[PDB]
Amino acid sequence: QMLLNQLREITGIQDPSFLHEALKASNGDITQAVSLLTDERVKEPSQDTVATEPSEVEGSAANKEVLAKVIDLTHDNKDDLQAAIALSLLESPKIQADGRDLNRMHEATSA
Protein backbone atom coordinates (compact mmCIF):
# COMPACT_ATOMS: atom_id res chain seq x y z
CA GLN A 1 0.00 0.00 0.00
CA MET A 2 3.26 2.12 0.11
CA LEU A 3 2.53 4.47 -2.89
CA LEU A 4 -0.96 5.42 -1.48
CA ASN A 5 0.46 5.92 2.05
CA GLN A 6 3.49 7.96 0.86
CA LEU A 7 1.48 10.29 -1.45
CA ARG A 8 -1.28 10.77 1.24
CA GLU A 9 1.40 11.68 3.83
CA ILE A 10 3.24 14.23 1.56
CA THR A 11 0.06 15.81 -0.07
CA GLY A 12 -2.51 15.61 2.75
CA ILE A 13 -5.30 14.15 0.54
CA GLN A 14 -7.21 11.48 2.52
CA ASP A 15 -9.27 10.24 -0.50
CA PRO A 16 -7.64 6.88 -1.66
CA SER A 17 -8.98 7.24 -5.27
CA PHE A 18 -7.41 10.74 -5.68
CA LEU A 19 -4.06 9.17 -4.69
CA HIS A 20 -4.37 6.41 -7.37
CA GLU A 21 -5.46 9.01 -9.97
CA ALA A 22 -2.38 11.17 -9.22
CA LEU A 23 -0.11 8.07 -9.69
CA LYS A 24 -2.14 7.41 -12.92
CA ALA A 25 -1.73 11.05 -14.10
CA SER A 26 2.05 10.94 -13.47
CA ASN A 27 2.29 7.50 -15.28
CA GLY A 28 3.76 6.04 -12.00
CA ASP A 29 6.12 8.86 -10.82
CA ILE A 30 4.96 9.62 -7.20
CA THR A 31 6.95 12.95 -7.04
CA GLN A 32 5.07 14.26 -10.16
CA ALA A 33 1.86 12.89 -8.55
CA VAL A 34 2.49 15.24 -5.55
CA SER A 35 3.19 18.21 -7.93
CA LEU A 36 -0.13 17.55 -9.77
CA LEU A 37 -2.19 17.32 -6.51
CA THR A 38 -0.48 20.46 -5.10
CA ASP A 39 -1.62 22.38 -8.27
CA GLU A 40 -4.26 23.79 -5.82
CA ARG A 41 -1.34 26.06 -4.60
CA VAL A 42 0.93 25.88 -7.77
CA LYS A 43 -1.83 27.21 -10.19
CA GLU A 44 -0.93 30.85 -9.26
CA PRO A 45 -1.26 33.24 -11.11
CA SER A 46 -4.87 31.91 -11.21
CA GLN A 47 -7.66 32.52 -13.84
CA ASP A 48 -9.65 35.79 -14.38
CA THR A 49 -10.61 36.89 -10.83
CA VAL A 50 -11.69 40.41 -11.93
CA ALA A 51 -10.56 42.88 -9.18
CA THR A 52 -13.71 45.06 -9.48
CA GLU A 53 -16.20 45.85 -6.67
CA PRO A 54 -19.88 46.33 -7.97
CA SER A 55 -20.83 50.06 -8.03
CA GLU A 56 -23.51 50.71 -5.32
CA VAL A 57 -24.82 53.49 -7.65
CA GLU A 58 -26.20 51.88 -10.88
CA GLY A 59 -27.56 54.59 -13.25
CA SER A 60 -28.07 51.87 -15.91
CA ALA A 61 -31.65 50.89 -14.87
CA ALA A 62 -32.50 49.74 -18.41
CA ASN A 63 -31.09 46.14 -18.42
CA LYS A 64 -32.12 46.15 -22.12
CA GLU A 65 -29.11 47.42 -24.16
CA VAL A 66 -30.16 48.32 -27.75
CA LEU A 67 -26.81 48.98 -29.48
CA ALA A 68 -28.09 50.20 -32.87
CA LYS A 69 -25.44 52.20 -34.83
CA VAL A 70 -26.29 55.10 -37.25
CA ILE A 71 -23.27 54.41 -39.58
CA ASP A 72 -25.69 53.82 -42.55
CA LEU A 73 -23.71 55.70 -45.27
CA THR A 74 -26.39 54.89 -47.87
CA HIS A 75 -25.08 57.50 -50.35
CA ASP A 76 -26.41 55.34 -53.31
CA ASN A 77 -25.08 57.95 -55.84
CA LYS A 78 -26.06 56.79 -59.36
CA ASP A 79 -23.60 57.03 -62.33
CA ASP A 80 -26.25 59.10 -64.21
CA LEU A 81 -25.89 62.54 -62.42
CA GLN A 82 -22.15 61.83 -61.76
CA ALA A 83 -21.32 61.28 -65.44
CA ALA A 84 -23.73 64.17 -66.37
CA ILE A 85 -21.90 66.77 -64.17
CA ALA A 86 -18.52 65.14 -65.09
CA LEU A 87 -19.34 65.44 -68.87
CA SER A 88 -20.50 69.08 -68.44
CA LEU A 89 -17.24 69.92 -66.57
CA LEU A 90 -15.12 68.01 -69.21
CA GLU A 91 -16.62 70.16 -72.07
CA SER A 92 -15.53 73.36 -70.14
CA PRO A 93 -14.49 75.90 -72.96
CA LYS A 94 -10.87 77.03 -73.67
CA ILE A 95 -12.23 80.53 -72.80
CA GLN A 96 -10.25 81.26 -69.57
CA ALA A 97 -11.79 84.76 -69.06
CA ASP A 98 -15.64 85.24 -69.29
CA GLY A 99 -15.97 85.51 -73.12
CA ARG A 100 -12.70 85.95 -75.12
CA ASP A 101 -14.29 84.35 -78.26
CA LEU A 102 -14.32 87.86 -79.80
CA ASN A 103 -10.48 88.13 -79.65
CA ARG A 104 -9.41 90.52 -82.48
CA MET A 105 -13.06 91.68 -83.08
CA HIS A 106 -14.01 94.76 -85.16
CA GLU A 107 -16.57 96.88 -83.18
CA ALA A 108 -17.22 99.01 -86.34
CA THR A 109 -17.76 102.29 -84.38
CA SER A 110 -17.53 104.70 -87.37
CA ALA A 111 -16.51 108.00 -85.66
Helix content: 25-40%
The main β sheet shows up as:
none
CATH architecture of the domain at 1-44: Orthogonal Bundle
Number of helical runs? 5
N-C termini distance: 139 Å
Domain UIM: 76-95
Subunit structure: Interacts with ZNF304. Interacts with PRKD1. Interacts with TP53BP1. Interacts with isoform 1 of FBXW7; following DNA damage, dissociates from FBXW7 leading to degradation of MYC.
Organism: Homo sapiens (Human)
Modified residues (Phosphoserine): 46
Which terms would index this structure?
111 residues; mainly alpha; Helicase, Ruva Protein, domain 3; Single alpha-helices involved in coiled-coils or other helix-helix interfaces; 0% strand; Ubiquitin carboxyl-terminal hydrolase 28
Structural notes for this entry:
The structure is a monomer. The chain is mainly alpha-helical and 111 residues long. The chain contains five helices and no strands. The termini are far apart. Interacts with ZNF304. Interacts with PRKD1. Interacts with TP53BP1. Interacts with isoform 1 of FBXW7; following DNA damage, dissociates from FBXW7 leading to degradation of MYC. It is found in: Nucleus, Nucleoplasm. Belongs to the peptidase C19 family. USP28 subfamily. This is Ubiquitin carboxyl-terminal hydrolase 28.
